[PDB]
Amino acid sequence: GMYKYIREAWKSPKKSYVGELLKQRMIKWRREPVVVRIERPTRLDRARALGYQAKQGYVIVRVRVRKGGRKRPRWKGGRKPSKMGQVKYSPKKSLQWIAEEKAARKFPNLEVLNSYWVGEDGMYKWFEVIMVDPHHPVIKSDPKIAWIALKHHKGRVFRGLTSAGKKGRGLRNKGKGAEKVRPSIRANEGKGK
Amino acid sequence: VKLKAIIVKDRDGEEFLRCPRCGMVFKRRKDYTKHVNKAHGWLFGRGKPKGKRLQKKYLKASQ
Amino acid sequence: MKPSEIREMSIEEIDAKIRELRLQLAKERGLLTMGTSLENPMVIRNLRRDIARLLTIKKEKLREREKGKV
Amino acid sequence: ARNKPLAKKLRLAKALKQNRRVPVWVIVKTNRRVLTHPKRRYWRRTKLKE
Amino acid sequence: MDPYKVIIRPVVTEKAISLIEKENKLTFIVDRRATKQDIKRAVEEIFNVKVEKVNTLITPRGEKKAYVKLKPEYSASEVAARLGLF
Amino acid sequence: AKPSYVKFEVPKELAEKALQAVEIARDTGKIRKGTNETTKAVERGQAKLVIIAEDVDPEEIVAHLPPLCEEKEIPYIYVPSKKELGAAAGIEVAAASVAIIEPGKARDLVEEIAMKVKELMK
RNA sequence: GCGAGGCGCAGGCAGCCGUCGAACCGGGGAUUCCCGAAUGGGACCUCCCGCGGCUUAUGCCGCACUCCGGGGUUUAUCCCCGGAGGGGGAACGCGGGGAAUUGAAACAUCUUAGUACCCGCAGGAAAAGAAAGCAAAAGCGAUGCCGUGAGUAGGGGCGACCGAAAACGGCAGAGGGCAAACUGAACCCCGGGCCGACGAGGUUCGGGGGAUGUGGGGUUGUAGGGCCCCCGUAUGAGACC
RNA sequence: GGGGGACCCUGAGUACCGUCGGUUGGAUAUCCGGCGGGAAGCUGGGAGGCAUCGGCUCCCAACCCUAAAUACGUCCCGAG
Ligand SMILES: [Zn+2]
């Protein structure tokens, strides 16, 4: 099918027409808002693998975030030399996670399912996020996604239950080296990461 | 083993049928029946478990 | 008054009774601060509760009529 | 003070109605047990909360 | 406000009685949410009289008091006698 | 202005002829509607003519069809509207690409379209 | 339901309610002012000021913002239909940000400490959960919790101090679904009708989605699955509504 | 419901490498994040506490859900 061709094209954008397409696309995107809904996913194979379907209740949102780490605000009280660091710091959440949370803030009645990287220049990074409406009967009637309509699945992106959240929590490792990862970071004294 | 559905409620208060064996939730009774059969029929001799580890576990449990 | 005798009459009679009892309650409330030799100090309470009964039963009758019509 | 909003006037009215002594029949009924309430007020010594 | 829910009670003080005798004025403690038009309509409908003027004030106890002056064709003494004020 | 996957300029009469061929093939011969089915037919070498819409967004949907058809030696033609392509294909939604397996009563028309495409830019 | 008294804390005056069964008690209803997420628009005062429909009038309904699924037009994101989020909760939970007094007999790595506190997000629990694992004579077989491993391996101005997992014995035990290969509208939702029983189930019409793929199928390692070929079977057995 | 095949499928800015900051008992051998690079993809891939080569053993990531055994007490029963 065409999914393998899309995957092959997006394997390395600079080695295909995707390089020029993305060069024009970022020029177009830099003038768009930080969070904006789009009609169809750019990477159809990635969307389908992560769970997107062509039915009512699924929306796609492109989010742009700034590259780099974070700078801590200046400390007002006294600090010891080990606590004065300001510049060389990075967020413990990935930029994909931050973009997902921004999309969740923009859309209050929807739930984050997954997201994928779609491009980046030297200043910005772009992610496309799949949102699901849990109150739509079409969504409720599909057993693949109907689980998201339950009460205890509220704010999953904020609580760290998406793929990016699990990657940040370190739930992708088992056995040696993952002692302080399960059952939760807080349950392991918050020292597993 | 009994595979009777368990009623659970939605955010809006709608009813869902939950499989007691795996936890999957459905809105259609036909879908629930089809899932129960196709997924757990091997417990009644209609099929075999999926996975080498599960097959070994079931063989050890049986004998 | 009693709920049975209240239910025995219709909506218009209930409304007229409610208006009469409201006026009578106002008159007794005036007489309470006017005079001192009050033979029955429970007139105000009895009138208030009869008004409550009349309103409740009238609303019940309206609900029953709507249910029957639908 | 000359110009007063209605809500503040109503709150002052409630405080004024609160400020009064315990009824003699209440004292008789309680058998000298209930003699006062904690809402008594003197306008020049104990001031209002608002 | 619907009439028969406006008037709470009459006022039977010495000032009230003197006003009744002299200026053809009744005086009622009425609902605080009622306006002058509501008071006028309530008095007219209840007592089958014509109201000339309505003045209102809010007492220091939070109640609303209304002075209702009747037209010269109607006597407030008769209404007071009907209401028991005398 | 045209998307990068468009390799040549198709005249309006040629596009209309392609749409008419698609309609006749749907009526009497055999067609495949949908990008997945068209790609599978091209890979299996069963397609006699491929029709691609010029208003596909994103371009990744049909960006492989021109190189694949050139590699497999199968003629293809561009049409303006995917909505009208789907309407000709008979479905109630737009079709990004269509393949003609059995021309049926449009054999000569398909041959003429293929010859014109080969002469113009192949 | 109880069965003769009752009208709160609360021992008074006068009255009234109860045998047509009260008070009281279990269940179901009615009323439920204003502010408050406060939501049509405003608040130096929990009070004020509006616009569209119906209504004779009384009076009732609708009108916040950020979105989702739709319709219309003036295409203004303007109007209408249906549906979401907001705020609260003693402790427990999940995800981020993160000190110093103090100890080291001073103090900077360290400790205090991923602590106090801050920010965000859920529930009656939450999170985790079915091996690209643990182990090497042998093997085990999802997750979570308890005992122990153990102040051990190990970190540390190797200073003060910090510090596990596997295995073993227990409580409880349960496993499933996608993406793709293949097929190709055989599909889902909303509303109406008809059969069936009013339900399950079956069928039909209009609208919204859907060929940028709805539905069917498939979920795994000395491999599993799709497709093709060959032999057999269903007459039966079972599960669920 | 079982056998065979020579055809097809099995998740990418991902695994992983270098460097920087945080975190960890994780020590040249923990986990998380930023920056610069970045595959194979079934004739395939990963792990086995410094790095590489050979053997052997175990396994199939980069998608999702899952009751019971547990934690608490604004509340209730019971007890000291
Ligand atoms: Zn099940």
From Swiss-Prot, chain C:
Coiled coil: none
Pfam families membership: Ribosomal_L29 (PF00831)
Keyword annotations of the record: Ribonucleoprotein, Ribosomal protein
GO cellular component, one term: ribosome
GO biological-process terms attached to the record: translation
InterPro entries: Ribosomal_uL29, Ribosomal_uL29_CS, Ribosomal_uL29_sf
Top-level taxon of the source organism: Archaea
UniProt-recorded Gene Ontology molecular function terms: structural constituent of ribosome
Family note: Belongs to the universal ribosomal protein uL29 family.
Subunit architecture: Part of the 50S ribosomal subunit.
Protein name as catalogued: Large ribosomal subunit protein uL29
Species annotation: Pyrococcus furiosus (strain ATCC 43587 / DSM 3638 / JCM 8422 / Vc1)
Curated annotation (Swiss-Prot), chain D:
Gene3D superfamilies linked: Ribosomal protein L39e
Pfam families cross-referenced by the UniProt entry: Ribosomal_L39
GO CC annotation terms, alphabetical: ribonucleoprotein complex; ribosome
Keywords: Ribonucleoprotein, Ribosomal protein
Taxonomic lineage: Archaea, Methanobacteriati, Methanobacteriota, Thermococci, Thermococcales
GO biological process: one example: translation
Protein name according to UniProt: Large ribosomal subunit protein eL39
GO molecular function: structural constituent of ribosome
Family in the record: Belongs to the eukaryotic ribosomal protein eL39 family.
UniProt xrefs under HAMAP family: Ribosomal_eL39
PROSITE patterns: RIBOSOMAL_L39E
Oligomeric form and interacting partners: Part of the 50S ribosomal subunit.
From Swiss-Prot, chain E:
Keywords for the protein's UniProt record, in alphabetical order: Ribonucleoprotein, Ribosomal protein, RNA-binding, rRNA-binding
Pfam families assigned to the protein according to its UniProt record, in alphabetical order: Ribosomal_L23 (PF00276)
Any single GO CC term annotated in Swiss-Prot or TrEMBL for this entry: ribonucleoprotein complex
Tree of life domain: Archaea
GO biological process: translation
Entry-linked SUPFAM superfamilies: Ribosomal proteins S24e, L23 and L15e (SSF54189)
GO molecular function: rRNA binding; structural constituent of ribosome
Summary of subunit composition and partner proteins: Part of the 50S ribosomal subunit. Contacts protein L29.
Function: Binds to 23S rRNA. One of the proteins that surrounds the polypeptide exit tunnel on the outside of the ribosome.
Family under the similarity heading: Belongs to the universal ribosomal protein uL23 family.
Descriptive protein name: Large ribosomal subunit protein uL23
Organism whose genome encodes this protein: Pyrococcus furiosus (strain ATCC 43587 / DSM 3638 / JCM 8422 / Vc1)
Swiss-Prot record, chain F:
UniProt record, GO biological process: rRNA processing; translation; tRNA 5'-leader removal
UniProt-annotated location(s): Cytoplasm
Keyword match Signal: no
Domain of life: Archaea
Keyword rRNA processing (UniProt): yes
Main localization category: cytoplasm
Family: Belongs to the eukaryotic ribosomal protein eL8 family.
Record text on subunit structure and interactions: May be present in up to 3 copies per 70S ribosome. Part of the 50S ribosomal subunit, where it binds 23S rRNA at its canonical site near the L1 stalk, as well as a possible second 50S binding site near helix 25 and a possible third site on the beak of the 30S subunit. Component of box C/D small ribonucleoprotein (sRNP) particles that contain rpl7ae, FlpA and nop5, plus a guide RNA. These sRNP particles form homodimers, giving rise to an asymmetric holoenzyme. Probably part of the RNase P complex.
Function per UniProt: Multifunctional RNA-binding protein that recognizes the K-turn motif in ribosomal RNA, the RNA component of RNase P, box H/ACA, box C/D and box C'/D' sRNAs. Component of the 70S ribosome. Component of a box C/D small ribonucleoprotein (sRNP) particle that is involved in pre-rRNA and tRNA processing. Utilizes the methyl donor S-adenosyl-L-methionine to catalyze the site-specific 2'-hydroxyl methylation of ribose moieties in rRNA and tRNA. Site specificity is provided by a guide RNA that base pairs with the substrate.
PANTHER family named among the record's database cross-references: RIBOSOMAL PROTEIN L7AE FAMILY MEMBER
Name used for this protein in its record: Large ribosomal subunit protein eL8
Gene: rpl7ae
